[PDB]
Amino acid sequence: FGNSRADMEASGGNSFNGKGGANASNTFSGTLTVTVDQVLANGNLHVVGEKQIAINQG
Amino acid sequence: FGNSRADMEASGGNSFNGKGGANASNTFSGTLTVTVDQVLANGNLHVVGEKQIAINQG
Ligand SMILES: O=C(O)[C@H]1C[C@@H](O)[C@@H](O)[C@@H]([C@H](O)CO)O1
Ligand SMILES: O=C(O)[C@H]1C[C@@H](O)[C@@H](O)[C@@H]([C@H](O)CO)O1
Numbered sequence: 001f002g003n004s005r006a007d008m009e010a011s012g013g014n015s016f017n018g019k020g021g022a023n024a025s026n027t028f029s030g031t032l033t034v035t036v037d038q039v040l041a042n043g044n045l046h047v048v049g050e051k052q053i054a055i056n057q058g
Numbered sequence: 059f060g061n062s063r064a065d066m067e068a069s070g071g072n073s074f075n076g077k078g079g080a081n082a083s084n085t086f087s088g089t090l091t092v093t094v095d096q097v098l099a100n101g102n103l104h105v106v107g108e109k110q111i112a113i114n115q116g
Contacts (some may be wrong), residue, residue: 024114
């Protein structure tokens with residue numbers, strides 16, 4: 001060890017960060033009167049309805 | 059002792075400190091409905107279940 005033959009110095013680093021996300025929301029707060037389309041074998045009713053409103057410009 | 063023949067002075071030190079540690083934790087807070095795969099001899103049930111959710115983009 002007379003010289004710096006044994007003198008040693010070293011550093012090392014490794015950092016990793018990963019992220020991920022997702023969202024999906026929906027809301028509906030109306031009331032619509034529909035009409036029966038047909039009666040199924042079990043008695044369930046197929047209902048279809050439509051409502052058109054022309055407030056102004058569309 | 060006329061000269062510094064007996065005059066003496068010396069110092070010495072040796073300090074060592076080592077440390078080590080480790081941690082490992084995990085948590086899981088879900089609910090999943092599984093289905094029986096087979097019935098063992100002692101009556102134990104082999105249960106396997108799977109649930110796939112596509113929120114959006116994955
Ligand atoms: O004993 C040896 O082998 C050495 C001592 C150091 O001086 C070393 O650096 C080398 C030098 O390269 C000679 O020129 O020689
Ligand atoms: O009695 C001796 O042997 C000594 C006395 C000191 O003077 C010592 O240092 C030595 C010196 O080297 C002579 O030149 O001689």
